[model samples]
Target: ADFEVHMLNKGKDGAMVFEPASLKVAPGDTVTFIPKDKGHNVETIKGMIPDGAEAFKSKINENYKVTFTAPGVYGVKCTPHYGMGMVGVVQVGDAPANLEAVKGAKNPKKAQERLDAALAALGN
Candidate 1:
């Protein structure tokens, strides 16, 4: 089964947030991004992806889907709203081999806040 992650402008949590903000799924799972609001898209954050995992993105206002195979945390963001903290983390499989690198990657002030929260949800 696939996981649905909403691209929301204003959600139960706050504005410009990916509903849930964090997800844990198995490898080979397909994650879908629903454009619940305008001006949002999903993309991988640089230096936040596992080694050998290719960068992925979706155009603004479009529904995007990605199948993850690598077993690690994938830092996600909405390109247009990234500065405002529209970020999420997708944990694929059980082994978070690149967790350290993902944590080390730089992020926008607000984005970092969201990222930290999401990372916390994953636990150590």
Candidate 2:
């Protein structure tokens, strides 16, 4: 399966959000982060992605892709607007193997606050 995420603003939701802030994909699926505006980027949060899965950071306004091949939750952030709560979550398979780590992954306090809310929105 393929999922698409667009940067509407610098946050999570439509018209200034990640649009589909939480997504679900099968193992081996791919997600493409597309920027509807400039100055946006994508990065997988450290300690939040599946173990052995490489984390990524894209240059500004550049479309970046991530492949999900493991079973867990992938927490994401837009570095430039993370403090504004520009965070997202991806569920590859149903059960999350890294929920706790995803919870503790290193993020700025403000970003963490936003990230935490984003994860919470996932509702497990």
Candidate 3:
């Protein structure tokens, strides 16, 4: 219900991965990003946040937490590793509100696969 944690894994089996690459939480719920393997940072993906919501970016290995008051899907990633498919998704308030917009947004082609996989639960 709150303080759900997510970790940024820099490398494992030669791959960069984010635990629970896809997460769903209700409004008012909080999510935390912690560095499990370092050299990774959490940042909001462009065009992927709910309107009026604040975008966040964390220094490498710096922990970040956000409370979701807005209902929508958010795309997150580790800047340095995004091109290697290091990306994730967050959904708030149950059913996705902006699923179409998120699916239509232009993303770095390299990370689309990861994004797609992360958002598959939303039927995008």
Candidate 4:
């Protein structure tokens, strides 16, 4: 299924976050990042993308979309506001092959907590 992730200044949970911070999609599905607010961009976190997936990023205030061709979890962050926990997760397929790698990646303290919560939404 196609999805849209909104970049916002304030979201349901707090400030500087992606709406619906966690997502589950199938391989080949496309996810779009809409920068509803200025100064926000979407980028993949280092070591958090699946081995076969390519890293992606969007220019500030621009919308970007990517098709999930691989099966694994992808960690996303807003470059400018990551320190305030502007992060999200997209689970493509069921197997979390790179979960350990994602968990080991360094992140700002608040971002780390949001990342953990997003990953936990994957359930089993």
| lDDT tens digits by residue: candidate 4, 54-76 | 99888999989889988888999
lDDT of each: 0.90, 0.77, 0.78, 0.91
Off by over 4 Å in 1: none
lDDT per residue for candidate 3 within 20-64, as digits (tens), equals 787888888888887777698888899888888889888898877
Estimate the overall C-alpha local distance difference test score of candidate 2.
0.77
RMSD list, candidates in order: 0.9, 2.4, 2.3, 1.0
lDDT of 1 by residue, 2-108 (tens): 99999988986698999879999987899899888888999999999889988998999888889998889999999988999999999986669888888899999
For model 2, residues 1-124, the per-residue Cα lDDT tens digits are: 8889887674434334576777878988889999878888888877788888878898888888878887888888887877776777888877687887777778777666655666676676
Q: Give the worst 10-residue stretch by lDDT in candidate 1.
A: 93-102
**Pick by lDDT: 2 or 4, better one:** 4
Task: List, in order, the clash count of every candidate structure.
Answer: 0, 2, 0, 0
lDDT order of candidates, top first: 4, 1, 3, 2
lDDT, candidate 3, at 57:
88
- Which residue pairs clash in candidate 1? none
**Weakest lDDT window of 10 consecutive positions for candidate 2:** 8-17
